[PDB]
Enzyme design. Sequence first.
Site, PDB file in Angstrom:
ATOM      1  N   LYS A 197      89.400  28.779  17.297  1.00 50.52           N
ATOM      2  CA  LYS A 197      88.615  30.005  17.907  1.00 50.52           C
ATOM      3  C   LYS A 197      87.416  30.188  17.115  1.00 50.52           C
ATOM      4  O   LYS A 197      87.238  30.545  15.880  1.00 50.52           O
ATOM      5  CB  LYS A 197      89.535  31.348  17.995  1.00 50.52           C
ATOM      6  CG  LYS A 197      88.877  32.701  18.756  1.00 50.52           C
ATOM      7  CD  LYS A 197      89.757  33.747  18.377  1.00 50.52           C
ATOM      8  CE  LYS A 197      89.117  34.897  19.206  1.00 50.52           C
ATOM      9  NZ  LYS A 197      90.115  35.719  19.639  1.00 50.52           N
ATOM     10  N   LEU A 217      88.824  24.450  25.527  1.00 46.92           N
ATOM     11  CA  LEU A 217      89.788  25.229  25.744  1.00 46.92           C
ATOM     12  C   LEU A 217      89.890  26.579  26.365  1.00 46.92           C
ATOM     13  O   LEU A 217      90.588  27.159  27.219  1.00 46.92           O
ATOM     14  CB  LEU A 217      90.903  25.172  24.677  1.00 46.92           C
ATOM     15  CG  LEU A 217      91.168  23.623  24.020  1.00 46.92           C
ATOM     16  CD1 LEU A 217      92.081  24.019  22.747  1.00 46.92           C
ATOM     17  CD2 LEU A 217      91.906  22.888  25.097  1.00 46.92           C
ATOM     18  N   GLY A 258      85.152  33.380  26.441  1.00 49.10           N
ATOM     19  CA  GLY A 258      85.360  34.436  26.964  1.00 49.10           C
ATOM     20  C   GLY A 258      83.967  35.180  26.359  1.00 49.10           C
ATOM     21  O   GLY A 258      82.988  34.642  25.777  1.00 49.10           O
ATOM     22  N   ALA A 259      84.134  36.610  26.215  1.00 54.52           N
ATOM     23  CA  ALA A 259      83.124  37.392  25.530  1.00 54.52           C
ATOM     24  C   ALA A 259      83.306  37.474  24.083  1.00 54.52           C
ATOM     25  O   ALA A 259      82.161  37.556  23.337  1.00 54.52           O
ATOM     26  CB  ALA A 259      83.119  38.875  26.180  1.00 54.52           C
ATOM     27  N   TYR A 260      84.609  37.210  23.769  1.00 52.48           N
ATOM     28  CA  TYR A 260      84.719  36.811  22.283  1.00 52.48           C
ATOM     29  C   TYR A 260      84.102  35.576  21.790  1.00 52.48           C
ATOM     30  O   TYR A 260      83.975  35.663  20.555  1.00 52.48           O
ATOM     31  CB  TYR A 260      86.384  36.294  22.158  1.00 52.48           C
ATOM     32  CG  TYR A 260      86.797  35.237  23.108  1.00 52.48           C
ATOM     33  CD1 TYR A 260      87.067  34.273  22.376  1.00 52.48           C
ATOM     34  CD2 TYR A 260      87.493  35.271  24.254  1.00 52.48           C
ATOM     35  CE1 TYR A 260      87.402  33.008  22.951  1.00 52.48           C
ATOM     36  CE2 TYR A 260      88.043  34.358  24.914  1.00 52.48           C
ATOM     37  CZ  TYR A 260      87.985  33.146  24.180  1.00 52.48           C
ATOM     38  OH  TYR A 260      88.384  31.845  24.811  1.00 52.48           O
ATOM     39  N   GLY A 261      83.786  34.564  22.386  1.00 54.15           N
ATOM     40  CA  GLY A 261      83.133  33.122  21.866  1.00 54.15           C
ATOM     41  C   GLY A 261      84.048  32.383  22.929  1.00 54.15           C
ATOM     42  O   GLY A 261      84.131  32.553  24.053  1.00 54.15           O
ATOM     43  N   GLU A 262      84.443  31.055  22.095  1.00 56.07           N
ATOM     44  CA  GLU A 262      84.960  29.920  22.664  1.00 56.07           C
ATOM     45  C   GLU A 262      86.278  29.623  21.864  1.00 56.07           C
ATOM     46  O   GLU A 262      86.401  29.917  20.773  1.00 56.07           O
ATOM     47  CB  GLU A 262      84.040  28.976  23.082  1.00 56.07           C
ATOM     48  CG  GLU A 262      83.177  28.207  21.900  1.00 56.07           C
ATOM     49  CD  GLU A 262      82.231  27.265  22.088  1.00 56.07           C
ATOM     50  OE1 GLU A 262      80.952  27.690  22.050  1.00 56.07           O
ATOM     51  OE2 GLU A 262      82.629  26.180  22.456  1.00 56.07           O
ATOM     52  N   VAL A 263      87.143  28.687  22.769  1.00 54.46           N
ATOM     53  CA  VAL A 263      88.272  27.932  21.971  1.00 54.46           C
ATOM     54  C   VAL A 263      87.946  26.520  21.920  1.00 54.46           C
ATOM     55  O   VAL A 263      87.737  25.972  23.294  1.00 54.46           O
ATOM     56  CB  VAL A 263      89.514  28.044  22.283  1.00 54.46           C
ATOM     57  CG1 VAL A 263      90.771  27.364  21.661  1.00 54.46           C
ATOM     58  CG2 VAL A 263      89.771  29.860  21.938  1.00 54.46           C
ATOM     59  N   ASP A 296      99.046  42.584  25.829  1.00 51.96           N
ATOM     60  CA  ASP A 296      98.619  41.805  26.881  1.00 51.96           C
ATOM     61  C   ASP A 296      99.438  40.593  27.154  1.00 51.96           C
ATOM     62  O   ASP A 296      98.854  39.462  27.216  1.00 51.96           O
ATOM     63  CB  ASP A 296      97.254  41.691  26.530  1.00 51.96           C
ATOM     64  CG  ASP A 296      96.243  41.350  27.976  1.00 51.96           C
ATOM     65  OD1 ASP A 296      96.803  41.811  28.952  1.00 51.96           O
ATOM     66  OD2 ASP A 296      95.150  41.009  27.920  1.00 51.96           O
TER      67      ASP A 296
HETATM   68  C1  LIG Z   1      95.400  21.932  25.727  1.00 49.19           C
HETATM   69  C2  LIG Z   1      95.023  23.345  25.994  1.00 49.19           C
HETATM   70  C3  LIG Z   1      95.097  24.558  25.548  1.00 49.19           C
HETATM   71  N1  LIG Z   1      95.685  24.859  24.425  1.00 49.19           N
HETATM   72  C4  LIG Z   1      95.487  25.973  23.749  1.00 49.19           C
HETATM   73  N2  LIG Z   1      96.199  25.642  22.486  1.00 49.19           N
HETATM   74  C5  LIG Z   1      96.068  26.706  21.706  1.00 49.19           C
HETATM   75  C6  LIG Z   1      95.311  27.802  21.818  1.00 49.19           C
HETATM   76  C7  LIG Z   1      94.998  28.972  20.891  1.00 49.19           C
HETATM   77  C8  LIG Z   1      94.310  30.023  21.251  1.00 49.19           C
HETATM   78  C9  LIG Z   1      93.734  29.963  22.554  1.00 49.19           C
HETATM   79  C10 LIG Z   1      93.817  29.019  23.657  1.00 49.19           C
HETATM   80  C11 LIG Z   1      93.023  28.971  24.554  1.00 49.19           C
HETATM   81  C12 LIG Z   1      92.607  30.401  25.335  1.00 49.19           C
HETATM   82  C13 LIG Z   1      93.542  29.563  26.104  1.00 49.19           C
HETATM   83  C14 LIG Z   1      94.761  27.942  23.060  1.00 49.19           C
HETATM   84  N3  LIG Z   1      94.698  26.928  23.804  1.00 49.19           N
HETATM   85  C15 LIG Z   1      94.711  25.532  26.625  1.00 49.19           C
HETATM   86  N4  LIG Z   1      94.380  24.874  27.572  1.00 49.19           N
HETATM   87  N5  LIG Z   1      94.392  23.518  27.364  1.00 49.19           N
HETATM   88  C16 LIG Z   1      94.141  22.665  28.603  1.00 49.19           C
HETATM   89  C17 LIG Z   1      92.543  22.831  28.784  1.00 49.19           C
HETATM   90  C18 LIG Z   1      91.997  21.764  29.834  1.00 49.19           C
HETATM   91  O1  LIG Z   1      93.050  21.833  31.240  1.00 49.19           O
HETATM   92  C19 LIG Z   1      94.706  21.624  30.734  1.00 49.19           C
HETATM   93  C20 LIG Z   1      95.045  22.535  29.675  1.00 49.19           C
END
Ligand SMILES: Cc1c(Nc2ncc3cccc(C4CC4)c3n2)cnn1C1CCOCC1
EC number: 2.7.11.1
Length: 262
Positions: free
Chosen positions: A36, A13, A16-21, A121
């Site tokens: 996260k 999802l 970044g420099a933080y890591g990944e989601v 932010d």
């Molecule tokens: C389901 C979805 C999310 N949710 C999604 N839900 C919760 C999150 C909580 C913290 C951080 C993040 C991400 C850094 C943004 C999050 N993100 C984000 N992006 N996405 C899809 C990725 C593929 O493209 C379509 C959208």
Amino acid sequence: VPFVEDWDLVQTLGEGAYGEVQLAVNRVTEEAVAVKIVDPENIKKEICILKMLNHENVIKFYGHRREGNIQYLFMELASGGSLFDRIEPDIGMPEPDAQRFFHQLMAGVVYLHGIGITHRDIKPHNLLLDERDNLKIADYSLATVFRYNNRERLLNKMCGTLPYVAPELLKRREFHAEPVDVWSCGIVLTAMLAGELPWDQPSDSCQEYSDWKEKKTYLNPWKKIDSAPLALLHKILVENPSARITIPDIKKDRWYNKPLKK
Ligand SMILES: Cc1c(Nc2ncc3cccc(C4CC4)c3n2)cnn1C1CCOCC1
């Protein structure tokens, strides 16, 4: 129940420099969450703010596991992605959709400011959407306490994202936390209504910010914004943060209260 502790990581999802989601899906229940994943004092502060959050327009924290020196932060998943991806470049989105998002934004910011937390932010990348397009304020990695025991503390740290940052953070040593988050919500609005950012940063050298201070709303992005929301932006994007509209007065604005959306 055996195996309900186990989650499969199924989609990236964000990185970044933080890591990944990662999108995580429970082996037994198929519950979907966001995890996260990071590789010390900062993550400690972040977890502490994350535990304080309980509102429908802020991302919910479910808790954390450490394995080794890797921290896994489990949180609410917003399956519709970010608000950034609903903004059409150079167009924005329909005014009723934008107003509805702005209502939810204000509800979440009211909430955070109520518990003495500033986000620092606010931008369309940090505003996520659930299956019903409800807006969730994400990313607490710059958030900090500005009120504790009913006493306010002034901020001095320079942070955020330049086209979103209020001008006082570029001009003054110290500043109040709340007018900063309100300004960035204004820039969010402009972006939803115009599909573009009004200036590189709000500084005296930036011709696009001077044009605004001089009322040249016959120029873009302002000329694309109907008079009612543009009135509201004239009250949010005020240089003096002490004269800038507060949230209680935004809730009294004509556009904010205009019926638009079915
Ligand atoms: C389901 C979805 C999310 N949710 C999604 N839900 C919760 C999150 C909580 C913290 C951080 C993040 C991400 C850094 C943004 C999050 N993100 C984000 N992006 N996405 C899809 C990725 C593929 O493209 C379509 C959208």
